[PDB]
Amino acid sequence: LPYKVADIGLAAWGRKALDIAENEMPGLMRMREMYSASKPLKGARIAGCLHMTVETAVLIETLVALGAEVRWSSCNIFSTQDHAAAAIAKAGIPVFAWKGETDEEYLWCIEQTLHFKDGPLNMILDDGGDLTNLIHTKHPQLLSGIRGISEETTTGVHNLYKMMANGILKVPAINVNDSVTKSKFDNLYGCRESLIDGIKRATDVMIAGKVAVVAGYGDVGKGCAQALRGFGARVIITEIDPINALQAAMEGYEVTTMDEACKEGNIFVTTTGCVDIILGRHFEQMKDDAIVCNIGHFDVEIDVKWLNENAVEKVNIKPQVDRYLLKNGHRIILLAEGRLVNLGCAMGHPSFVMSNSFTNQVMAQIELWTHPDKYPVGVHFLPKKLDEAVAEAHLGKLNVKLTKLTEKQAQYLGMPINGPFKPDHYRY
Amino acid sequence: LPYKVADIGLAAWGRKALDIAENEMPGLMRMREMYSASKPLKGARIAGCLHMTVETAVLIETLVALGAEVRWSSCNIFSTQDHAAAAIAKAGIPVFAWKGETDEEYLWCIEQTLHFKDGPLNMILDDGGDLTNLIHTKHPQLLSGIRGISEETTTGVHNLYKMMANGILKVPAINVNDSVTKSKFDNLYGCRESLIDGIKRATDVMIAGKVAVVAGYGDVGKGCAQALRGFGARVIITEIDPINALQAAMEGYEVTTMDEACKEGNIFVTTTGCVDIILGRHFEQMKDDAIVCNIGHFDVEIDVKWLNENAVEKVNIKPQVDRYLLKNGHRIILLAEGRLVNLGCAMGHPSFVMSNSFTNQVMAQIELWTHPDKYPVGVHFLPKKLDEAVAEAHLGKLNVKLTKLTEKQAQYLGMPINGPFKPDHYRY
Amino acid sequence: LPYKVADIGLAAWGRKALDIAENEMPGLMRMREMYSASKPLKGARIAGCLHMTVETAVLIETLVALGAEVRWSSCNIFSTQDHAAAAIAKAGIPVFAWKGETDEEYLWCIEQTLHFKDGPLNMILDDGGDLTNLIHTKHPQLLSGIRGISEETTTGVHNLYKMMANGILKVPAINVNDSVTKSKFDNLYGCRESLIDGIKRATDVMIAGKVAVVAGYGDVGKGCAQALRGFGARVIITEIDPINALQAAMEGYEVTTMDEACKEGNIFVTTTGCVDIILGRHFEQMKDDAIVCNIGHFDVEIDVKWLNENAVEKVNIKPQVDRYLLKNGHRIILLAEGRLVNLGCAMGHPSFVMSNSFTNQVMAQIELWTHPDKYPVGVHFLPKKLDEAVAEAHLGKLNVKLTKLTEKQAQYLGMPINGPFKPDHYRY
Amino acid sequence: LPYKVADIGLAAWGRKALDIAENEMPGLMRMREMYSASKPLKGARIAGCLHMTVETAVLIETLVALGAEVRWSSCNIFSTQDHAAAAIAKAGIPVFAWKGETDEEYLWCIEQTLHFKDGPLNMILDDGGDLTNLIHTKHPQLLSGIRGISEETTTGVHNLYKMMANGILKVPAINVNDSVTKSKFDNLYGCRESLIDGIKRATDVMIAGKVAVVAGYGDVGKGCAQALRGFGARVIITEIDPINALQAAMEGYEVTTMDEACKEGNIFVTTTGCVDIILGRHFEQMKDDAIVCNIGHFDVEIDVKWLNENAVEKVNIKPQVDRYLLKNGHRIILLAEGRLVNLGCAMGHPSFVMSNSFTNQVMAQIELWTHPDKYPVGVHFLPKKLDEAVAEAHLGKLNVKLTKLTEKQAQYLGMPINGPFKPDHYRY
Ligand SMILES: NC(=O)c1ccc[n+]([C@@H]2O[C@H](COP(=O)([O-])OP(=O)(O)OC[C@H]3O[C@@H](n4cnc5c(N)ncnc54)[C@H](O)[C@@H]3O)[C@@H](O)[C@H]2O)c1
Ligand SMILES: NC(=O)c1ccc[n+]([C@@H]2O[C@H](COP(=O)([O-])OP(=O)(O)OC[C@H]3O[C@@H](n4cnc5c(N)ncnc54)[C@H](O)[C@@H]3O)[C@@H](O)[C@H]2O)c1
Ligand SMILES: NC(=O)c1ccc[n+]([C@@H]2O[C@H](COP(=O)([O-])OP(=O)(O)OC[C@H]3O[C@@H](n4cnc5c(N)ncnc54)[C@H](O)[C@@H]3O)[C@@H](O)[C@H]2O)c1
Ligand SMILES: NC(=O)c1ccc[n+]([C@@H]2O[C@H](COP(=O)([O-])OP(=O)(O)OC[C@H]3O[C@@H](n4cnc5c(N)ncnc54)[C@H](O)[C@@H]3O)[C@@H](O)[C@H]2O)c1
């Protein structure tokens, strides 16, 4: 097929969005001005499996502008924004995705990107193992023609590692997930901004003066706490890792166990990425009308089945907002049914944060492709100098003035004027 | 007529809204558990003129629950939430209000609240001066029958002082507007919570890393500055008063003139309450896609007409979000048409802030009513013990444990154990 | 006598300090550039009772530089810095003060400033009742020749008020203590900077990760909390006033009672200005080696007698640092023996803050003297425009750019381009 | 000789110091209560070369309490606190150290720690490389007798890598310098606490309202910026690395070049660790009385010679505080002669930060010693479970309640309940 969007008529609407986003995504735009001549991806036939949204569309066109031939599929049945896919389809790009697909239409869409006008894909841009998987299990003949892979998710990267272990990984991968520019944004900065958006949009609740308990103090936890803290709330953190617990303490946050914190919190945010964070025994302790939500792993953190199964009432107050009544007579306001509150009750992360994650994708794609034999099969990390590069693509928009190391300082520090500035073990 | 609501069908739904807001309006709830049995307002016939909302309905039932007789109407033609009005009328309270009234129906609505079964109104609860102006200008027969006035707005209060200056004021008034609990929650705390919600709902923009220029550093300016700062923006302040300016400087904020700041910021917030804050000469200097919103005085602060008259294009991006292309090639994203961004792009202030302003009002009603021979015709401030009292009604929900001064300490401090704890010139 | 310093030889050492301070005290220096021509105090014969320190010395010379004839005495037997008094004495100014005087030498010193070469004092600049008192009870003949008084302490002002009440106040006063520029600095900004200085210098203790309980949340408590909070500690506040308790809560601080907080705090700071804040019953609860100190009222806040009388051991670890051993086997580190920790274990407030407090003194002196009959007997507040003036004397050093109201905005706001910008009830 | 301390008379006083520091060094205290009975270091003959301080003494007694045989010396000629040295010697531990040693006595002091009654050293605990270099260059006979090396400095560690690169390293080493708990407390947290202390002790200057320019934004830069920020200064960052620079921008800090910042700041802090940060061309642009200090690399960051060779005057205001008059009329206040302000003008890092660096050392010692056939000749990192372990030894004093992962969650997360909790590439 030429492509498949829900309403190509929505294409004019999307472009308008794409163009506003471009301003907030200076990364992908610098890639365009830096390479839309050298056309570095000239030759690449990139199959991409990634949520078809405005930001992703801006990514796609950056790939296309750098000389890449591209076919796209959304890695989530609902994540795709139709006016954005409409614009791409209209742009003459083979996009197969609409909001509200079936598992059937989903697998179909992905398969629809494997074959180009002059041969099958020779590159992969994945979010969530799916694309690398489908080809690995149901189309292994293609593997040899694929020069590389770029993966930007925890899941996908664990898989590339598992697959590697089992010797299934046939094509070299580049883990963009752990880039400091991708992680700090996708995790810390994104959640810091979008968390309170979900809460306010869903409840319009005053945050100042409330006690907010945050399970987990990893990047997402650090951002969620900082955010709440700046609003006027008393953040209590819970942790299993002594190093992360120490960091919380050093910053002035109380750190206890949920078994205790549940009796004190007014808002509860989970960040763990692990099961059984908030249980029935916790709900029974909570104050009347506590707001409970999650921004870590899709629904495995809060025990919603208990709420559904033990509450005396449940009344949907609005989309993504339920308020249960317990036998103790206390209500509990649950957000997005335990799913992600920022994507579920708000719009998820700002374009600027996507600019960092997606610019990481472009950086991987250009490197793998332009580097035929330097990367062995297996999941490798994005070379730091490239990581430094995506950071540098955003200064400017931020009106930051990087100072240049002089030849004398360079030699003194024993580092190139623009080569990597920190060793591979440097935690920033 | 017994009432006049756009639709009494939303009543059952209005109640739903009310029973949820009550939880965030502990001020109104303590007033009840504290005076509903005793009925201090027993005998008062209160005419109220104040935006008919969920939060205001909670207030009304509090006044009613204290032995008051009440007739109500809005103080703005649109402000009135119909399901809230419907439930008030459904409860048997005479409310003459609906969203979208014609200027003609508004006056009529006020007229209805002036007479009760047992007689005319003997108490005014105003927000704006409308009721008090109407009663004076068009109903002076009633003046000698009204025991007291209760006002909570700057416009309304200025009006009172002006009438009194002209010797036209004939009934004592209490200015609840300048109570620390009214002012702090309405100006400082309210806008701190909501400013960013407006900007995000309208633009979904990343705040961190942006230079935000806030004009003014009064209560609104302080809250707006603090908010943006907690998000990661580099706030720059502008001011005319050396003291407020010094306060900003002492907190780490740069303080300049708009004439210089315009060349730098990405987000502009007005908090002044004065005219001609952002003129075209400034717009011509702004960076591409600067966001310019106002949260101070409705429309006077930004030169919107200039935008309208000098932009090459103008496109509505979504309700309350407009984007102008200027002759220099830059785009100016203007929010709420230069009107209050919190009210125009968000949902205004949280119930909790309302709980402070309204408890201040219940307080004023109770006191004026209960001390007929206490207040000379004039516009007085709320006794500090009452201001502290409204503050205390909220401790508790805040999980605050207030300590009680012993008799020795009270004696050492020379203040009553419960009596006011600060002199009238105490700025908190 | 010509004067009386401990060691005039120390006079060269002083001038060196005076000159460095001048830089951080832009206020008194702008007074000099604005008035060392008009010589507004020409004629005044100012007797001054203020701690003879370097800052005060910079003050004195400003007075002298503005045409004033001056005689000085220190309002505290130990507060006087000899190299500073030495420079003044050397400069040809009658200063009678040395660190470590007797109550006898103290009263003597004060009397030594009542008479000038050409008659007795005609002005008074006091800090702590003393000067106004001595003349009022032991030299009432002088009262008539005294044109005005400037008082800048809570004590002194309560007294001016009490005296006024009793009809004893013969000469008009101006309370500089409550100026927003004097108060915010003397209380908020000063203590915020100096508190941790005392604790660190005395203990060299890590602040981050500790629970710090602050009694009181007025200006001093706000500053102390903010200070600790920025170092990484978890500040718990205790209050008797509901309004101040609300402010703490709204800022994210837990607010309890000392009865509870004593069991949790690692550092304790009292800000109250009231007796019995920390008692024996609290020490018995405290964690091992808690650091307890005070920065409010001299010694009445912490129960030191209990510590002395119940501890099993006490060992002075260094000047202003005692460590008690309780019967429970827990130690308690006490600072400056319950006296002010910033003055006692550090250097008190920075010059820039004294600049604000003292410039208020110069302001009052110039106003009273220059305004022969506009001030009736009684303690008056420093007119706002003068308060705005001292604020503006410091912008510039701070490199702040005040923006000027245009004639159009001025009229719109109904205020002068430079006249007072806020009403008398404005709490900043 | 059994030891060699400048004076063993301070012993009883040293102990006093030690018994106080112990409370703030829970890491060392837990190792004892955890391993003193079991004596894991039983048999080890540890030669240690580390600044002989109170904090270091606590460490020594810990290694001792764990069954280790120890001989010690400093790793700097001045660093060694004599009363601390005296107490260790007084307890029967062979310490060869005193403050103010000649370069010649230093080498000798080291030599002493090389031989024990039962034989030569079989373990190295080094701070700087000296011991390890001396053993290699001057005592290779001993090499095959030493089981392992423990190093905690950048210099020392770079040395290990270099020797290992030249194939000279003959004994395995563990780099405790790059453990998160060592780095975070030494670079980030330590400096955060002490930087401002240095500036205050040296200048007693008001920080709020000043523009502070921090050169660099690594761990030291981060803590220094955060510190100054909490005081009310407007921090401006300078950086060569795009990522760190983005990090600063994402927090609100302006990022420019020193070439521009010099014209604006009032306080200047270097954190770079690189040469030529503040040159004469910058000095000539600074405002009057700017403060310029260094907290990074000893003396290389600021061009002091320039000051010395181009200032018209130069005056020592107090130890470690010098002030230069430049030909342009401005004065430059330089602290610690361009050396580490925290150590030169304050008391260095708090015991608690040292408690982290040293528990890291006890850890490495215990591990290498207890795993003879585990480490290949080379410089390794501290196993993450040990790093998490030193972190946990401090939770507790911090009033932190670490939660334990259930077997289910453990299995869901795919990590041991106690085992490491993050991959090696995890940047906290
Ligand atoms: N937009 C979004 O909503 C969004 C964005 C990015 C990442 N995430 C997801 O959020 C989750 C956390 O990501 P992160 O990057 O912050 O992870 P991380 O590994 O940095 O942090 C996880 C933290 O949770 C802690 N934790 C684990 N089990 C715990 C337990 N049972 N109780 C308390 N604390 C516990 C861990 O110790 C760890 O410190 C992941 O699921 C990530 O995939 C969501
Ligand atoms: N919900 C809302 O959106 C909401 C809520 C409360 C108040 N307000 C309105 O917001 C505005 C500000 O109120 P406030 O309580 O903060 O007032 P305020 O008087 O406390 O603060 C106004 C400040 O703006 C400064 N200012 C005046 N003219 C200026 C100029 N021309 N340039 C720069 N700075 C200037 C003044 O010095 C003053 O400090 C008012 O109109 C107020 O009524 C809006
Ligand atoms: N350099 C210094 O150390 C310095 C400087 C300025 C002022 N002060 C002094 O410190 C004290 C505080 O002054 P301020 O300006 O902050 O005062 P304030 O009047 O603004 O605040 C005092 C606070 O203490 C609270 N309080 C009273 N009794 C209390 C109690 N028993 N328990 C808990 N809270 C209690 C009060 O409610 C009040 O909020 C005063 O004695 C002042 O004279 C010290
Ligand atoms: N007690 C103390 O005073 C103490 C304690 C620990 C570390 N340090 C020292 O402080 C220094 C910094 O250590 P760190 O841990 O922060 O290191 P780091 O590498 O983490 O930080 C250094 C940063 O400075 C930046 N930088 C380098 N050259 C620059 C230049 N020319 N101009 C501007 N920015 C530049 C780099 O990009 C880097 O981000 C080191 O010398 C370290 O050894 C001092």
Tab-separated table of N, CA, C and O and ligand atoms in Angstrom, chain B residues 186-187 191 216 218-220 238-241 244 271-274 277 295-297 340 342 349, chain C residues 403 405 409 422 426, ligand 2:
chain	number	residue	atom	x	y	z
B	186	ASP	N	-4.602	34.346	47.381
B	186	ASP	CA	-5.114	34.815	46.116
B	186	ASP	C	-4.037	35.365	45.182
B	186	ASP	O	-4.034	35.049	43.989
B	187	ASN	N	-3.141	36.201	45.700
B	187	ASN	CA	-2.069	36.774	44.890
B	187	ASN	C	-0.861	35.836	44.750
B	187	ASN	O	-0.617	35.310	43.673
B	191	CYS	N	-1.470	32.062	42.075
B	191	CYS	CA	-0.732	32.199	40.825
B	191	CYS	C	0.523	31.325	40.777
B	191	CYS	O	0.973	30.926	39.697
B	216	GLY	N	7.282	42.864	37.381
B	216	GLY	CA	6.687	43.145	38.671
B	216	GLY	C	7.188	42.092	39.632
B	216	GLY	O	7.611	41.006	39.219
B	218	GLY	N	5.502	41.911	43.037
B	218	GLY	CA	4.608	42.071	44.158
B	218	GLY	C	4.249	40.636	44.484
B	218	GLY	O	4.985	39.724	44.112
B	219	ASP	N	3.097	40.398	45.095
B	219	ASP	CA	2.721	39.036	45.432
B	219	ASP	C	2.594	38.114	44.232
B	219	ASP	O	3.063	36.991	44.269
B	220	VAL	N	1.977	38.584	43.160
B	220	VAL	CA	1.819	37.759	41.960
B	220	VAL	C	3.205	37.501	41.356
B	220	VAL	O	3.582	36.351	41.079
B	238	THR	N	11.572	42.775	36.491
B	238	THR	CA	11.544	44.186	36.108
B	238	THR	C	10.718	44.815	37.230
B	238	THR	O	9.860	44.128	37.796
B	239	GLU	N	11.000	46.068	37.598
B	239	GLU	CA	10.278	46.722	38.695
B	239	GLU	C	10.413	48.241	38.705
B	239	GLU	O	11.291	48.803	38.066
B	240	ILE	N	9.507	48.903	39.405
B	240	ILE	CA	9.543	50.353	39.535
B	240	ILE	C	9.812	50.747	40.989
B	240	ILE	O	10.351	51.818	41.258
B	241	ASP	N	9.472	49.848	41.913
B	241	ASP	CA	9.634	50.086	43.341
B	241	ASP	C	10.974	49.519	43.784
B	241	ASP	O	11.197	48.312	43.715
B	244	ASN	N	10.813	46.221	46.344
B	244	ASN	CA	10.446	44.945	45.731
B	244	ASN	C	11.626	44.491	44.905
B	244	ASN	O	12.035	43.328	44.979
B	271	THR	N	2.779	41.024	35.623
B	271	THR	CA	2.250	40.905	36.977
B	271	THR	C	2.021	42.295	37.608
B	271	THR	O	1.575	42.461	38.738
B	272	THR	N	2.269	43.294	36.798
B	272	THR	CA	2.192	44.675	37.177
B	272	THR	C	0.903	45.324	37.672
B	272	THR	O	0.906	46.013	38.688
B	273	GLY	N	-0.174	45.183	36.911
B	273	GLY	CA	-1.432	45.830	37.266
B	273	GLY	C	-1.414	47.254	36.702
B	273	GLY	O	-2.268	48.082	36.993
B	274	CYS	N	-0.455	47.505	35.822
B	274	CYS	CA	-0.258	48.795	35.189
B	274	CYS	C	-0.281	48.597	33.679
B	274	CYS	O	-0.149	47.488	33.194
B	277	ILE	N	3.099	47.690	29.568
B	277	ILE	CA	4.242	46.891	30.039
B	277	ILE	C	5.010	46.286	28.858
B	277	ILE	O	6.224	46.403	28.792
B	295	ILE	N	-0.857	37.917	33.696
B	295	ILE	CA	-1.550	37.268	34.813
B	295	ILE	C	-1.912	38.313	35.847
B	295	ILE	O	-2.441	37.982	36.907
B	296	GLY	N	-1.646	39.573	35.500
B	296	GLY	CA	-1.966	40.687	36.374
B	296	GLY	C	-3.367	41.286	36.190
B	296	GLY	O	-4.383	40.724	36.624
B	297	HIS	N	-3.424	42.442	35.544
B	297	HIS	CA	-4.675	43.150	35.308
B	297	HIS	C	-5.217	42.796	33.918
B	297	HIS	O	-4.521	42.982	32.918
B	340	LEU	N	-5.851	37.228	31.667
B	340	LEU	CA	-5.289	36.369	32.702
B	340	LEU	C	-5.071	34.959	32.193
B	340	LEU	O	-6.019	34.218	32.002
B	342	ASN	N	-3.980	32.357	33.762
B	342	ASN	CA	-4.434	31.307	34.672
B	342	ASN	C	-5.909	30.992	34.479
B	342	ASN	O	-6.296	29.836	34.378
B	349	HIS	N	-7.460	29.469	40.241
B	349	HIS	CA	-6.869	29.038	41.517
B	349	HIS	C	-7.510	27.793	42.112
B	349	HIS	O	-8.708	27.567	41.944
C	403	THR	N	13.136	50.461	36.787
C	403	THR	CA	12.536	51.013	35.598
C	403	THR	C	11.641	52.134	36.078
C	403	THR	O	11.062	52.054	37.153
C	405	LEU	N	8.496	54.701	36.083
C	405	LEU	CA	7.099	54.807	35.707
C	405	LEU	C	6.965	55.987	34.727
C	405	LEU	O	7.594	57.033	34.933
C	409	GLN	N	1.683	55.881	32.885
C	409	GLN	CA	1.447	54.821	33.861
C	409	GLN	C	1.239	55.402	35.243
C	409	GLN	O	0.392	54.924	35.993
C	422	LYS	N	3.521	52.065	47.242
C	422	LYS	CA	2.627	51.150	47.950
C	422	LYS	C	1.973	51.893	49.105
C	422	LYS	O	2.482	52.914	49.562
C	426	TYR	N	0.781	47.874	52.996
C	426	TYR	CA	1.429	46.897	52.159
C	426	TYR	C	2.514	46.130	52.919
C	426	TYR	O	3.389	46.727	53.546
E	2	LIG	N1	-5.848	35.170	39.411
E	2	LIG	C1	-5.103	36.130	38.920
E	2	LIG	O1	-4.710	36.086	37.754
E	2	LIG	C2	-4.789	37.282	39.887
E	2	LIG	C3	-4.823	37.089	41.283
E	2	LIG	C4	-4.489	38.093	42.199
E	2	LIG	C5	-4.127	39.341	41.700
E	2	LIG	N2	-4.071	39.546	40.303
E	2	LIG	C6	-3.690	40.831	39.720
E	2	LIG	O2	-2.311	40.777	39.397
E	2	LIG	C7	-1.776	42.120	39.523
E	2	LIG	C8	-0.638	42.280	40.515
E	2	LIG	O3	-1.134	42.167	41.816
E	2	LIG	P1	-0.191	42.050	43.083
E	2	LIG	O4	-1.058	41.686	44.260
E	2	LIG	O5	0.975	41.226	42.712
E	2	LIG	O6	0.247	43.581	43.156
E	2	LIG	P2	1.385	44.374	43.910
E	2	LIG	O7	1.099	45.829	44.046
E	2	LIG	O8	1.717	43.575	45.111
E	2	LIG	O9	2.503	44.113	42.839
E	2	LIG	C9	2.570	44.931	41.688
E	2	LIG	C10	4.029	45.151	41.495
E	2	LIG	O10	4.294	45.483	40.119
E	2	LIG	C11	5.271	46.549	40.095
E	2	LIG	N3	5.095	47.376	38.880
E	2	LIG	C12	4.190	48.355	38.707
E	2	LIG	N4	4.362	48.992	37.523
E	2	LIG	C13	5.396	48.354	37.010
E	2	LIG	C14	5.945	48.651	35.797
E	2	LIG	N5	5.397	49.603	35.079
E	2	LIG	N6	6.985	47.942	35.358
E	2	LIG	C15	7.458	46.974	36.134
E	2	LIG	N7	6.931	46.704	37.335
E	2	LIG	C16	5.873	47.368	37.807
E	2	LIG	C17	5.049	47.319	41.415
E	2	LIG	O11	6.219	47.946	41.979
E	2	LIG	C18	4.460	46.295	42.394
E	2	LIG	O12	5.503	45.882	43.265
E	2	LIG	C19	-2.902	42.994	39.933
E	2	LIG	O13	-3.593	43.524	38.816
E	2	LIG	C20	-3.739	41.988	40.662
E	2	LIG	O14	-5.043	42.495	40.856
E	2	LIG	C21	-4.380	38.519	39.397
